[PDB]
Amino acid sequence: QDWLTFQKKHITNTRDVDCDNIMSTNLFHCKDKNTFIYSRPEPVKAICKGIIASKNVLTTSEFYLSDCNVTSRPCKYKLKKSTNKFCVTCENQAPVHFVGVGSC
């Protein structure tokens, strides 16, 4: 919904996200999946430089992604690491929603 929330929801300072901890908090409330981007914030913010009206943008470069995928046990996850482009909703020069991996 805004850049601060996007950072909290989708940017990780570690590749090896502790999914069973973080996904259990209110922000994620044991949902089935969440994609995290392993980067400091500025190169992620830069994806949306110049984009004012809300628009979905596919990254030009690939990034390190860490995905928390639920297992057969509720709120327990398998972490999957991959390198891919991703699509975000850019608004007023910052990411404000994560859309998907690989494609808009």
Residue numbers in the entry: 1 to 104
Give excerpts from the publication:
Onconase® (ONC, Alfacell Corporation, Somerset, NJ, USA) is a ribonuclease with anti-tumor activity isolated from oocytes of the Northern leopard frog, Rana pipiens. ONC is a member of the pancreatic ribonuclease superfamily whose archetypal member, ribonuclease A (RNase A; EC 3.1.27.5), holds a central position in the study of protein chemistry, enzymology and molecular evolution. Although ONC has only 30% sequence identity with RNase A, contains 20 fewer residues (104 versus 124) and possesses an alternative disulfide bonding arrangement, it has a highly similar α/β fold. The ribonucleolytic activity of ONC is essential to its cytotoxicity, and the target of this activity is intracellular RNA.
